[PDB]
Design a protein around this ligand. Structure first.
Ligand SMILES: OCCn1cc(Br)cn1
Length: 129
């Protein structure tokens, strides 16, 4: 894409130790599956393209970007060592939205709907075997 967008977050690195856990399997098969297909998912399914959206200040304000497209790749490509890393990526994505946008903007209402579902699913994250 454009040189004026930053490179996306890392999704592949052979030097980083990887593991499959039952919790990470739940994050892919239950949590991401649930949020990905939601009516309000589409703004979150890829990195924010600040050029196409005409938001030249976006990456001046958001220095820790994350999106569900990146999380999906991280889960599908077994990038994580634990569930906490992935949960943190979801929380970063929601906080980016809340920091950049005004309360009650449509995108914030959309994030809030996804977050409510996320919270319900994380409350049922299974005990690690
Ligand atoms: O200011 C950073 C580069 N940039 C320009 C537009 Br439009 C979007 N990103």
């Amino acid at each position: 894409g454009s040189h004026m967008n930053p490179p996306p977050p890392e999704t592949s690195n052979p030097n980083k130790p990887k593991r499959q856990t039952n919790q990470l399997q739940y994050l892919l098969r239950v949590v991401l599956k649930t949020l990905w297909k939601h009516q309000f998912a589409w703004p979150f399914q890829q990195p924010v393209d600040a050029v196409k959206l005409n938001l030249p200040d976006y990456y001046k304000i958001i220095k820790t970007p994350m999106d569900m497209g990146t999380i999906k790749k991280r889960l599908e490509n077994n990038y994580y060592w634990n569930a906490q890393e992935c949960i943190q990526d979801f929380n970063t994505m929601f906080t980016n939205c809340y920091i950049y946008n005004k309360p009650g903007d449509d995108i914030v209402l959309m994030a809030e709907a996804l977050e409510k579902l996320f919270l319900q699913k994380i409350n049922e994250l299974p005990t690690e075997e």
